[PDB]
Ligand binder design. Structure first.
Ligand SMILES: O=C(/C=N/O)NCCN1CCCCCC1
Ligand SMILES: O=C(/C=N/O)NCCN1CCCCCC1
Lengths: 540, 540
């Protein structure tokens, strides 16, 4: 009863809240502090563990969202507002949430840990689409989700220095994983069966924890949804990260005119600026106009990432690891209304040939003109080279394959061929309540609502098929969290999900229809990005 | 009767022979001299018109074949020896043949002029597969075919000199066209309706006469079968042509060590060598190991070709011209047994991945390593990158597209978009009597026997459907020769053959089935060869 809403952890006591679902109640503990507030002199520093507290911390509501840019491209539009912060912004944001079934599991239960995306510049665990009450009720697992510092507060890096080493947002996630190992048993969760799953930048974060030894021991399975650490947007070099941090300091008047600009005096000036001031100049440090590019992302520093993600993936041994990867059908369509010429969510975006050629330079930023010609060659239907509809779908494939599909396929192939058991999927169901235009198809990020069982919410207008389809996906994710295999171990009737291998390259399609096995995650398109295009740049 | 076998031309009197067909007799005049024998001091010189003769020249049999290399790759094999000379070799070979229907047409009849192929190093108008008795009988047209000098005797060029200017083999064809304008009326032919049609190097020759003003006035229609003048094999630069001519001279002891080596002394030494000696060292002149490359080809000298064929095609007005172009289904499979590793006509040629990678360098001779990577990328099925059968068909596509299909498609597109009406086809029928292995499919050059109605020969074992198929093809070629349109001028029952345009790119498939309209002569593959690869070669 109400006694299950009281839980004692290593830091102190907590009071949770009961959440209602159409199938039964769920105990939730929202806003658990796992770190000291990274404010004042702690800005840009790695997180410190939350010191124990006296009394009962109220864990009945979500805590504050980390300071981040708020999207204003389409004010009042559900498709964009659903990702904006739904709580007040604050640097005091290092809090996590725990959903546990009712009654509380008496036996150790596998744990799912969600890491939200948002290009490492935005996101929050309090968003309605991340509501874990339906996944926990239907599958009786323990779900944990944490907040981590985004933007400059989480990834501004002056490499080599000590006042701003970078990757502190990744250390926020690692500390939350250490908190799960020390306290998830109090909620009925098994710390020996922890499955990380995230989307976009969260998926890239899950991949970077696979490549970091201090983080690898905190979990046992990984699910990467529409993201990978080896993408062209997930990491930056030490020289570029220093240029962006110095440019942001210049934009906010750091250092004051006539003062030396070493790393100590530069970060000290940054720590005196209000948090909103740094956010208002975050986008003004990118090197060129582009889409799917972000200012402050994880940096290859030799510490958290001893080498580039590509180098660590190639030289890595992943025996004893189960991975679930996948993408949506239209990964790049969402990002085209953020810079590609001739695109608009309120029309058909029937772009011309000239707009397609210009959009390639925005979708593939800062590459040689010869490299851009190779992209146009592969993504042009030369039997209909001027068809606006085909060009619109072509540029969507350019951005999606370059940033998501091919980095994921590259990762999935190296993982399976080096010990790991990999399962791959392609999400091909467009939600009936999707507010984005029809030409975007199945946009990036809109499989999350089905993984979290949002169609089960009675206050929403999802169809009856989508409710059954959502329960299938929650079954897939939970079975992978329990056994490392998305297939139901009791049911040979259901169509089987074959593992992904570097040779067969088998994957399944996720939609209202039963499972369908296909081969190749755009093998022809991803051979251009992963094999030839690097050689075309090496010769310049 | 026998009176129609007697014909007087401008040079003198001729006696022909009556040829029998299952549908009626045909009057033939084989071995008509149209030029002085290019022997002795006339070697390497342009042809001179045949001086008038006394008495009756016997024109009842084919004359001598020009000196040329004889294929010895598969001795005793029908597939190769059907192209070898069937008459004695001699430099006295400039003779032409005329087939005219019986009874002789009283009205002017459209004239077809055949130019044989053979990589500009071999070929003869006396070959059995060029027998024009069936095309002339079934369609009541006048057919002319000539011999032209091949190899060094026709295309050895010391550019600038007067002793060996090059392209004299093309001038032999031009002189034969001037002979048709002056004498084809005596056989019942119309000198105002002359249609050139050729194959491989013959098709390239037909294209070069389109781009040469002195030759363009001698004909009115053109048919290019599996060849184009803009191919990477049909022409050679002035510097490379001088190196090959000097290397051939060195191989035969010219100049005698150690005397001067100016162009006059070099050609004088070459004219003293027996003709067979020059032939025996022809293949030891090419720069690298390759297939679909030939030693002595037309040279871009500024005379016969004022510029490169590519430049003349782009900056040319073709209004009032009707062109019929096309290719066979498997253009490159025949050339793979002539140098590609792992290939053999007597096995399945299931090559490995390494043999495919090495074969690309032979099929695409002397390109940058980066260019070879681009070819490997485009022609590799990255879902089955090691499948021997797919690699065999891939290398066949590499050679066929690079040398035939894409040069033809580039030509057909420029002709259609600049005034000329173009009809395109793809020959997809494999002859039931074909001696080449099954994996070659429809090899290069094996549509000729159907164009000339060879299945109508009662001494051969063609099927009943192939006889009907050959008759329908002869009607297509004759209708184009008569009216400029391969379609039936009045029959609406049979499906129509739409023209080829640079936008729609419509073509028809020629096989036992009725006409089927398709779009794009391998538009995706040929965009790589015609658009992207030249830019990759510019930026080395
Ligand atoms: O969102 C902005 C704000 N600029 O001030 N610019 C475009 C960046 N877009 C939006 C961020 C994720 C989608 C692709 C990249
Ligand atoms: O036939 C020879 C004779 N070499 O001495 N070599 C193979 C090169 N071939 C020759 C012409 C037929 C296939 C195109 C390239």
């Amino acid at each position: 009863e109400d006694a299950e809403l009281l839980v004692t952890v290593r830091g102190g006591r907590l009071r949770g809240i009961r959440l209602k679902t159409p199938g039964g109640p769920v105990s939730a503990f929202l806003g658990i502090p796992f770190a000291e507030p990274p404010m004042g002199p702690r800005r840009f520093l790695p997180p410190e563990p939350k010191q124990p507290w006296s009394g009962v911390v109220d864990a009945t509501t979500f805590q504050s969202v980390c300071y981040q840019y708020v999207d204003t491209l389409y004010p009042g539009f559900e498709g964009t507002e659903m990702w904006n912060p739904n709580r007040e912004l604050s640097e005091d944001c290092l809090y996590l949430n725990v959903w546990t079934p009712y009654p509380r599991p008496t036996s150790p239960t596998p744990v799912l840990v969600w890491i939200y995306g948002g290009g490492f510049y935005s996101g929050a665990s309090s968003l309605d689409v991340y509501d874990g009450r339906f996944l926990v009720q239907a599958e009786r697992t323990v779900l944990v989700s944490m907040n981590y510092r985004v933007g400059a507060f989480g990834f501004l890096a002056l490499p080599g220095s000590r006042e701003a080493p970078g990757n502190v947002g990744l250390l926020d996630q690692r500390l939350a994983l250490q908190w799960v190992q020390e306290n998830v048993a109090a909620f009925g969760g098994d710390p020996t069966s922890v499955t990380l799953f995230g989307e976009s930048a969260g998926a890239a974060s899950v991949g970077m924890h696979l490549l970091s030894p201090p983080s690898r021991g905190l979990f046992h399975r990984a699910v990467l949804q529409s993201g990978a650490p080896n993408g062209p947007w997930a990491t930056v070099g030490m020289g570029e990260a220093r240029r962006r941090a110095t440019q942001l300091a210049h934009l906010v008047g750091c250092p004051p005119g006539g003062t030396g600009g070493n790393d100590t005096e530069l970060v000290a000036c940054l720590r005196t600026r209000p948090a909103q001031v740094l956010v208002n100049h975050e986008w003004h440090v990118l090197p060129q106009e582009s889409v799917f590019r972000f200012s402050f992302v994880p940096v290859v520093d030799g510490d958290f990432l001893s080498d580039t993600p590509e180098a660590l993936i190639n030289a890595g041994d992943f025996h004893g690891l189960q991975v679930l990867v996948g993408v949506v059908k239209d990964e790049g369509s969402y990002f085209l209304v953020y810079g590609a010429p001739g695109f608009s969510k309120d029309n058909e975006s029937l772009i011309s040939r000239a707009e397609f050629l210009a959009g390639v330079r925005v979708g593939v930023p800062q590459v040689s003109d010869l490299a851009a010609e190779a992209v146009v060659l592969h993504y042009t239907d030369w039997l209909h080279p001027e068809d606006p509809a085909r060009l619109r779908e072509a540029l969507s494939d350019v951005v999606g394959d370059h940033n998501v599909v091919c980095p994921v396929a590259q990762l999935a192939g190296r993982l399976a061929a080096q010990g790991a058991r990999v399962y791959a999927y392609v999400f091909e169901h467009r939600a009936s309540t999707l507010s984005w235009p029809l030409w975007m198809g199945v946009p990036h990020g809109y499989e999350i609502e089905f993984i979290f069982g949002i169609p089960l919410d009675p206050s929403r207008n999802y169809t009856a098929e989508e409710k059954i389809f959502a329960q299938r996906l929650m079954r897939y994710w939970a079975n992978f969290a329990r056994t490392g295999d998305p297939n139901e171990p009791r049911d040979p009737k259901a169509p089987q999900w074959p593992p992904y291998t570097a040779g067969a390259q088998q994957y399944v399609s996720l939609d209202l229809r039963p499972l369908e096995v296909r081969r190749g995650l755009r093998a022809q398109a991803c051979a251009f990005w992963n094999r030839f295009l690097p050689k075309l740049l090496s010769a310049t």
